[PDB]
Design an enzyme around this catalytic site. Structure first.
Site, short mmCIF file in Angstrom:
data_model
loop_
_atom_site.label_atom_id
_atom_site.label_comp_id
_atom_site.label_asym_id
_atom_site.label_seq_id
_atom_site.Cartn_x
_atom_site.Cartn_y
_atom_site.Cartn_z
N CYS A 88 0.81 -1.24 0.00
CA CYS A 88 0.00 0.00 0.00
C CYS A 88 0.84 1.29 0.00
O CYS A 88 0.37 2.25 -0.52
CB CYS A 88 -1.01 -0.01 1.14
SG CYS A 88 -1.63 -1.66 1.56
N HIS A 356 -9.01 2.67 -3.71
CA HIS A 356 -7.71 2.32 -3.14
C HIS A 356 -6.91 1.49 -4.12
O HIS A 356 -6.71 0.29 -3.92
CB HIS A 356 -7.91 1.58 -1.81
CG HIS A 356 -6.63 1.22 -1.11
ND1 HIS A 356 -5.42 1.80 -1.41
CD2 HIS A 356 -6.37 0.33 -0.12
CE1 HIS A 356 -4.48 1.29 -0.64
NE2 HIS A 356 -5.03 0.40 0.16
N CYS A 386 -1.47 3.15 6.08
CA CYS A 386 -1.02 1.84 6.53
C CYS A 386 -0.65 0.95 5.34
O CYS A 386 -1.04 1.23 4.20
CB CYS A 386 -2.10 1.18 7.37
SG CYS A 386 -3.63 0.81 6.42
N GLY A 388 0.27 -3.24 4.02
CA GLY A 388 0.10 -4.65 4.31
C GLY A 388 1.41 -5.29 4.72
O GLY A 388 2.47 -4.97 4.18
#
Lengths: 401, 402, 400, 400
Positions: A88, A356, A386, A388
């Protein structure tokens, strides 16, 4: 050590899963955005030192999505270009690396961003087939789900890590759906008022007639509190995370041009903002959504600034459960109230409504912050998301009048 | 700005295609090598700032091969870890970024390397079937061939770019097979004398009988010779000069360096092996990817008061004999050195034709091989560089810390 | 109505899974056997009325394995050829249909058999992807396991139906393993004494070319103790193992059938006469019992009794299944287990020899015919169970 | 030998490719039609001798599509059921085999038809993968295109064999497009006048449930000039287009066949009698001429001539194929093209109605039977061409 300036910033509008951008390979989509930045700034592409491209789902594209972005945008062969994968955060980490290269004197002019076509990601027959498969069911893995959305240590969907934050901090289903509904409303106001017009580069989907894509298409204009409350749990029996309070699966690309002091003067590029500091943090993969908390801490500890100095904030909305948990912890650590955070965060809507596209979102939210900084005339803004596997990244930005 | 030191350097032995390392996923393979570095140096993993892992074939591994390397090596959750893909130069670009981070003051202690399991790479059904596939054959693409070996602009194999260099620069078949054979002989000599013993971290593969320990490069061909090489047929082009005998192989492997600022070396009592003096990243035409070391070496030297003639050892990755000979010819012209002078000090323990070319790790691999040979010979300056699919190269200039 | 005569009979040797026959497509494998039969009988192939070919796993071969068998054997375009699928009975049902056609006067000379390459069967991406597959994992089904070995109503392997028979009929693990060991011994004996030499047509696999002519599945390194130590193959705490079940195999087998006018006009000596046929059904949950109604149906068309059989071939899909059939047949027909044992599968059975599904029904008929001729017996019975809950049977009479 | 009577006849409406029948598996689709026959005749299913089911694309359905048709229609386990594959003729060849079985005294009551879900056919990864696949691209073949539509000897689409007939017989593009248009108009006429109402059994697709009872393939928005502007579909400069070729379709279709003894014993009234059958072979390159030897072999068993036929169904695989058959039939049997066309496919053909391959040979026989009944004629003929170079044919006699 030279200051690092953002001298250009453009993103695609964000497509829905299998939506308007779905025909475009990630290298081709990303190249259209870089080409937009090149045509507007009019910089000779031969003066770029490097192109750094966040990208997660690289299967099936042929060699180097990042180099494809540069070459198809018209950047000459002599300029190296490559890709990075920090799931991400990949679209912000490219910028962080460009920041380091400029600070260290290894570069003066860098294109850094991210690009993702979750629509175009295929399915994987495992390489164990090379030695043989005598009998039984052959399972092909969904490239998008496994390699962008599945934890590598617990084999859980990222939605389960969202449940873990919900359960651990007592963030209720109703609070998650209140957050989600608000993000939708804010996004729709931003879209319909023209708020995103400056930051969006139009993308042409070649076709029977070329289609021009310039308006985020994922915001849900037909939902409400009651409909959100009637959705079924999306990842675990009797869970609180739903498709309505989670972000979507999306395609998109976004890029910045970063310049040294020498480059700003030599090529007459006028800074939009300055990158004051960067941060990259790690947390337990099981509650990966909390990754912004160490990332934001490390970024501020490099400065004389505090969270209270920020006037705009972008915190990517992977899941309502995740963002509320981040907000909750940020309040305790930095001595700000949740109302103070919420009133200045994701003011034009967030990923729950906008989408996203994993490898590009970290750059997407930075572009959105930059353009809203300029519109409001505020001095400092924070972007963070955040990642992964249990990470976060963060950028502190300062307005350049 | 701080000097950038190499305080640790380890690699796997290189596995043959579908060979000893083939059961290991790239994150597991890499983690074993990082864990060796951790055990030898005794540094508390919590003091590492970041792990940067080159890796090209990331499909089917689940999220982030880089983070898998770090976590499964015993590095705490709080230490971020990720991966980079600049194809063949990926294990060297990761060091170059670590070099940047330390000079910028963004980091003090970095593990940077690459890992690649070409054997474990799968096959890709394209995402267009999500929208439907009404009728007709469906082709699954080899993830290895397409994403590591296929140019994205001309849809040609890397071996065809080797043919283009062999043609443009007049590299004959005979010269390619001479280079290839000499690479084999030097690698076998190094393997059999124990030359690689210092740099190789043993790798444990789980097996039904009991675990296999893999510590010896298995790709060098001990049965080939001049006449067998001359009898091979073209591998990529009708009437071509490039064969499986004068090209690198498909291989699995990993390789890592630990990089440290000056504060880190003192604070953690680390002993530098070498110093990284300068880096270079260059670009060329994709059609002649192999020529990528030339601008990259030029850029690295243009940051120093050093000339190519100052180098005592050189590692130049052998993607293809034609490519390496073409680089050599051009380096000689530009830097005023003879071919004899280059070849007496380049790839002195053999190169990728014999040892293998695990794409995302070779960039780091040839640097570890350079570092240990600099220590053994006691020389001051070594150069490592390699070409990159898509028309790029990277280079590192190293200085001995005696 | 004409009598129906078997005038030619040949089978391939049976290959192990991924074994010596594995490169051969089923059309090609079957064509070599039919062409052997053409070469030996020297009948003009243009005088054949039809070729009927049992074949189960037809995916990936292009149009009609049965027609490929005929065309590649040198049978002219004017002779129709096609395939039939009644799972395990397919190689016998083709003969049963030929028997019908000759009886009815619709044909005078027929080649009927079967062919199966379990090795060559591939894997199936389901047709639902034509409309799209938005996300999640995509499972390709094993064509062989699903389409030859998986029940369509209970989604169980044929091995589970063997377990159901062991449970219902009280057939112990030790009894299954004793039956299996005996089959291995008889098969090895038959192979090594050259007893199959007459019936086997050699097969050439282009490669230097390989000649395959000796059944390669029998296990020459097993014994009572090893069989008892195997673990259950299809359910925890079960009795069916890889050792008391048949294998996965490749092979083909064929017969030529002729009217009385054909026997005279082309001067072909009958090996045997097909006296009667039978096709029965049972519960799919105990498909192995299928031979019981098929055998009953065949005998009820004649004045013969089971006691009139001097040789029997009952295909050994599973030891549990075969012992279950034996138990019920002794009861129904008033013969003893020992009487059945001594004349059934005298040269070994599928546990040792293998089970190429679409061909086994013809295979066991070919083995029965040649043992009939060696022994000079009058009557022989062949029968086998069928996936889905069926059986087929043939009663044969020697021709002096 | 007993006469053979058709005592029931029902078919589904024919679905478009990925159309209304696409969610149904072929065994489920076929069972619904057999169950309609069972509920209409009110015969005890236990009195059926077997069910014979044409079906070509068998992959991924699990064991035995034929058996699935029977079991899911409510036919008891004791009644055997299986499938046959002679490509396009499979739905007629099942009836031919039923005809032989009754004639031979091997059966008295048989359900015979065909079923095909071309929409549901998958994609095939080849079994060579079992031994390993070291590198390079992996191709999955379309199960429908390869195993139903691709010649096994020349690796060509059936549309190429239509080109070969058009070229060899001089059948022009314009002659083909006029045949196609006329077929569309006759089909639309019949659908909208309720002509098919009697013969169609409604099918329920479980998606609220959908009731499908109307042929959905006829193209109501095409005309002469739209047909003239279509591109060639199979070869450069060719004459075959998507508008003058059959479609890809789903459907099922069955008959019940009864001996004289069965008609009396079970109080069944024949619709028609099957007088004779024919199965012929031709060169695979011009497979579409298959009906010519099939028809010839059928008439040569009777005292009837083509001139005695008052209605004809000839399947329209391709306008090029059907015109070439008509051209050849006229020469051999001494009838004019005008005479044939005025009595052939009077309610439209496969160009308009669709070509569910494993079912079509039964489908056109069902369509003949009901039109025979409406017109009160005595004699009709059904015939169709077959992949691999074959044909089948039935001669029918009205039982008034």
């Amino acid at each position: 050590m030279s200051k690092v300036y953002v001298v250009a910033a453009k993103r695609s509008a964000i497509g829905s899963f299998l939506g308007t951008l779905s025909p475009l390979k990630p290298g081709d989509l990303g190249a259209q955005i870089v080409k937009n930045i090149l045509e507007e700034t009019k910089v000779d592409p031969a003066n770029i030192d490097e192109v750094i491209v966040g990208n997660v789902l690289s299967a099936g594209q042929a060699q180097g999505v990042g180099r494809q972005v540069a070459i198809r945008a018209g950047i000459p062969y002599e300029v190296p270009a490559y890709s990075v994968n920090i799931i991400c955060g990949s679209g912000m980490k490219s910028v962080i690396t460009a920041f380091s290269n400029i600070k260290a004197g290894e570069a003066d002019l860098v294109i850094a961003g991210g690009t993702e076509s979750m629509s175009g990601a295929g399915f994987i027959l495992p390489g164990a087939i090379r030695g043989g498969h005598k009998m039984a069911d052959l399972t092909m893995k969904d490239h998008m789900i496994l390699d962008a959305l599945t934890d590598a240590y617990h084999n859980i969907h990222m939605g389960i890590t969202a449940e873990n934050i919900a359960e651990r901090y007592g963030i209720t289903r109703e609070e998650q759906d209140a957050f989600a509904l608000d993000s939708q409303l804010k996004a729709i106001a931003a879209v319909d008022s023209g708020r995103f017009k400056d930051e969006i580069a139009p993308v042409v989907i070649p076709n029977k007639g070329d289609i021009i894509f310039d308006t985020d298409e994922y915001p849900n204009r037909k939902t409400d509190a009651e409909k959100l409350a009637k959705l079924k749990p999306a990842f675990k029996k009797d869970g609180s995370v739903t498709a309505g309070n989670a972000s979507g699966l999306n395609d998109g690309a976004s890029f910045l041009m970063l310049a040294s002091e020498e480059a700003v003067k030599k090529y007459n590029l006028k800074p939009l903002v300055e990158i004051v500091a960067t941060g990259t943090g790690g947390v337990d993969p099981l509650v990966m959504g909390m990754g912004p908390v160490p990332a934001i801490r490390k970024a501020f500890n490099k400065t004389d600034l505090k969270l209270k100095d920020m006037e705009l904030i972008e915190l990517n909305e992977a899941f309502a459960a995740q963002s509320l948990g981040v907000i909750k912890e940020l309040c305790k650590e930095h001595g700000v109230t949740p109302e103070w955070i919420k009133e200045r965060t994701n003011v034009n809507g967030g990923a729950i409504a906008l989408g996203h596209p994993v490898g590009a979102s970290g750059n997407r939210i930075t572009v959105t912050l930059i353009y809203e900084m300029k519109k409001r005339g505020v001095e400092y803004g924070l972007a963070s998301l955040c990642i992964g596997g249990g990470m976060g990244t963060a950028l502190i930005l300062k307005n350049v009048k």
